[PDB]
Amino acid sequence: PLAAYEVDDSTGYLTSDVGGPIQDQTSLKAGIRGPTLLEDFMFRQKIQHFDHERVPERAVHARGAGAHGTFTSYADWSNITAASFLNATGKQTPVFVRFSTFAGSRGSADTARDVHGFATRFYTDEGNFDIVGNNIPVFFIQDAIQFPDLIHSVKPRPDNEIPQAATAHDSAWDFFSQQPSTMHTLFWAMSGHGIPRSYRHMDGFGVHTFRFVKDDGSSKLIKWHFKSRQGKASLVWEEAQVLSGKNADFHRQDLWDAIESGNGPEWDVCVQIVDESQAQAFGFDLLDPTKIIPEEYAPLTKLGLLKLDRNPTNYFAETEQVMFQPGHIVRGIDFTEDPLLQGRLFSYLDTQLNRNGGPNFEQLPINMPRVPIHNNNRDGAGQMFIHRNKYPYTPNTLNSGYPRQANQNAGRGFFTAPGRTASGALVREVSPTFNDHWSQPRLFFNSLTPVEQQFLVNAMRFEISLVKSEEVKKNVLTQLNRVSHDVAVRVAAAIGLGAPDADDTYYHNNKTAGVSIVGSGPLPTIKTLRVGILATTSESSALDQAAQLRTRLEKDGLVVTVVAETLREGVDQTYSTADATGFDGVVVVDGAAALFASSPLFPTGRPLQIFVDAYRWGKPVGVCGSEVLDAADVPEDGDGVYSEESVDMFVEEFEKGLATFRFTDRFALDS
Template sequence: MTKATKQGDSGKRAADAGTDDANHVGEGGELHQTASGEHPPLTTNQGVAVSDDQNSLRAHPRGPTLLEDFILREKITHFDHERIPERIVHARGAAAHGYFELTQSLSKYTTAKVLTEVGVKTPVFTRFSTVAGGAGSVDTPRDVRGFAVKLYTKDGNWDLVGNNIPVFFIQDAIKFPDLVHAVKMEPDRGFPQSATAHDTFWDFISLTPEAMHMVMWIMSDRTIPRSLRMVEGFGVHSFRLVNAAGDSTFVKFHWRPKLGLQSTIWDEAVKIAGADPDFHRRDMFEAIAAGQYPEWDLAVQLFTEEQAERFEFDHLDATKLIPEEMVPLQVVGRMVLDRWPDNFFAETEQVAFCPSHLVPGLDFSNDPLLQGRLFSYLDTQLSRLGSPNFHNLPINAPKCPFANHQRDGHMQTGIPRGRVAYEPSSLQSDSPREAATHGFRSVPRIEQGERGRVRAASFADHYTQARLFYRSQTPYEQAHIASALVFELSKVDHVHVREAMVGHLRHIDEPLAKRVADGLGLEELPPAPASSRPVQDMAPSPALQIIGKMKDTLEGRSVGILITDGSDAKALAAVKEASVAAGASVKIVAPKVGGTKLSDGETVSADGQLAGTPSVLFDAVAILLSEDGAKRLSKEAAAVDFVRDAFGHLKAIGVDSGGRALQKAAGVPTDAAGVVAADDVTRFISAAKTRVWDREASVRTLA
């Protein structure tokens, strides 16, 4: 098929998708496409025509999802069982054991012991993951990172299942199968793997205005993190804390990394994938092995029903966040991960997270995405682990006593004893009974409204918070978002999809739309789609940045030192000592791993061989070479790239006289910012703590 033919077909599809008279916009701003012409009616597997595939059935527009919604249940059940046994999403993961320690009691708001007993260390198992790729994909694609914590509390297991992004693509769980089908590898070709830069994803997104806020996040540096130890975690949804009086307070959960946020650069992330597909997994493993235990603060946003009513957005909408400037975060505890799993399959692969796993003192909100997840996750675990008894696996079993009347089933590893497997009963003195005083209780609340498939009108503003996020970024981060959009949309063959996305961007920020349109070679800006709500200008939130709030530290980072035979022993010792003192790990890179003889005659072993240990694996590099070594390496592509990439990725570079020769061979200017004399270790360490962002314009063209 020629390009012209493709584009001609695109025009026809654009007409079908965008100008069909049967299309209409719902109360919540969602697009409905009605069967007409060549489009057959959408039905269930039993042939029942579906009147609304955008909204699940709720008690009222902002009410809970109803179990009687057989369309939702069939759709999600089928989706949950599509793949066995790999997770449908979040298949590529790494996890660690540790503990959570409460530092500030929330007894005013909840009866949950894990949130009221200060100083108690609650065991946890935390799993990080990519979303789109399979188990064999790489660690560093542009992708959302899952952040799931299983807390083995005294009251039972609590699974806080979230992501490193506080919002999501969709508002209603009925759309989750469509989202994942769109983002996964295309079914007719089996690729791309672990990537969003393809037609089906952007086609779906271009027809889903509610996703625009999430698009800004996934195109930002948040989705190419430097380390799993340097990502935030979010519970995404609003939950409820319930106190002894039965009163509830809304809460959003945030995990904040002790090491601060740090990302890679896109070119760097791509090269890391080739150099070390297990980069994030290895980084976590090595940090724990070295006793540099990853740590996060747990912070909460607390707000009442009355406060929520005054928000300009609906907190039950998972595509929205509550700016920290509006509801400040309160740090209430910390999580430390201090032990790697003993067996990857038994623990990391078999762990089963379910948002429905709550403990007394917590409750759900009416967030329609959360309501669907309460069903979907459990259903998925039943399929993936093959049995309703997955809770008996050691990694999933509570560490507190538990008992019930559930019996038998495939893979039952427990041995329930006694005659009674029901209640009420009178035949067994130790059979489990209801916990009337401390059992789980749902918050009593009055639900009012007309039952039906309708989305709340308060969900209809799809662009205001997308604008908030983009305009809150530093100029560097805004440029990265624009460039990411150009890269992704350039991979899309269908022109009408590219144009549709640029049209959405016009609602978010007109200059952004122009930058992307120019990068795509569009001769004119496409029209912006109709918006059901006027786009508002919210006050910028600096808390949404990465660069603007990076910590001035080398702690948890890595410094690579390139040496050859004859390298200055004293210079090596000084750089290494200063880097370690600043909290960094140090790795020696050399042409040969077996041994390199230094200037004082000592032979040292390298941690990595030059060709297999490029500078993309480090946060800063030092080049310490003898004169002869510099001459040899100046003819070695791997050595030249070691310096060139470090410069292009805006890293600090420390050089001695031999290093200067390799710097020259790499075409790095002698007076370049961030390139310092290696013997000035204080200056080198200071430069190594951040990236030299002002250098970026000189090394790459940004949209």
């Protein structure tokens, strides 16, 4: 897709950037033990390049990973939008997607608790179109002008830069409790949505209401939903923390591997479509980015398939340099007066000047469109074009009036939806329609399963216990209590404060479908999921058992790692490097029982710790071949615990457990 820009260095002699053959291994010196010479241009060109390798990280979403793919339209959608990439059944458009966390710098861990980015570029035949989304459908704040306040509060305290990649500190919770618009996104982030199992096991949302615009000028209001076809799954917190140390690259590695193995992740690209007249019809304002439209009020329409199936060739050139903009819009789509969206349009154009160091960022290969460019933009640092038109102004005669103006009736121009209107004073005021900050947080909470609700309370217990300021903690309880008294009681208990009296203004009992993770049934596929087989080199029977388990499991598309004390044929990984965070299920082979009862080859207790960690974290665990299960204190009658002599019976059971994915009965509930 970017083949034209590729450079091959599999053969040939080293050259400078200007094609002069050189060496790069020894400096030029005055004598064999002498000082280095200023005239060594080989040294200086190489080291100057290295000195200047780094560019500023993204202001937010700095930690991320990307991949190429294809979007395929399901239909001709001309009846709802003029968008060209949606105008025919089976029409294909190349994409590039970057997934991310939100708060952390480059290098921070994939499995921090955070909002996640899900930014998609469609290189359409009518221009690049970006949907710059998250895995959570609502955002913290209601006006773009507050973005630096939110981000300052959530990022590390600026005297010492602590803590990394975490909301678990005074300033984040000060802001949350003073700015109650944050409640809805906060509840999402404190749920399993804050710690997804992978990029592939989360959805993407545009968050804002946008407009679909037909060629006849008429418009409808829409929300984007990218619905995962791998299913939705999360980690548990105590697992995620360990994972962040053991493998900070977990999500980017999971994505890379899935693509390399021919299991590229897919999403159905969907919209809710409603009329302009329904802006205020659902009990809230569609301009308000802290609100969802319950699917009960407006069902999803599947527009097409998004698949990622190609890894990048150079991370920096493609992933690090990809510069998304919501200003990258195409005919058939329009903005709304969402004050959060409104300000994003300014931000993403400006910020690329920082990242790129100059105004020609759209000329980077990953940013280039796949159609011709005709405009009178000129010059600027790093200018890569040589423009033939020496009269780049409009109106002109000396270039015969080209380029020609494009608009609703000519050249397939972008046009602002013509029904759009403005009225009233020029105000810095918030619409009173935005004022309910608590009902939908309560809607969300209500829609989670009992143990899901416990996880969310426990995440808040975890974070809020780390907040030093008593007054901040009290202010947080005041807000939580406006969402749910029971939530406020249960988190207050962990922090040795009393919950404030129930305040039932925004309490209710309503639920909405599609927001629960643990409630969303078994995973629709178990391909790519990781099984660790714990074995030993001290018994040949153990290795035979492991090999036979491997053959049967790999048939079904599972990634199998055989662990033992040392590497050899048939063994993938040593107990020294193995951890339960690296597996979705763990199997012990009968023949290795002795290991679970000291060695210079791995830390004491490592084999049983893997098995016990996995069990306590809710994973399917089993022995194939009661001795092991006793030592682990794992009950043989447990859901998601497996115990079988026959490899075929074991696998058939165990694969059911992998689809269930987490056995939530293993977690204690309040009162």
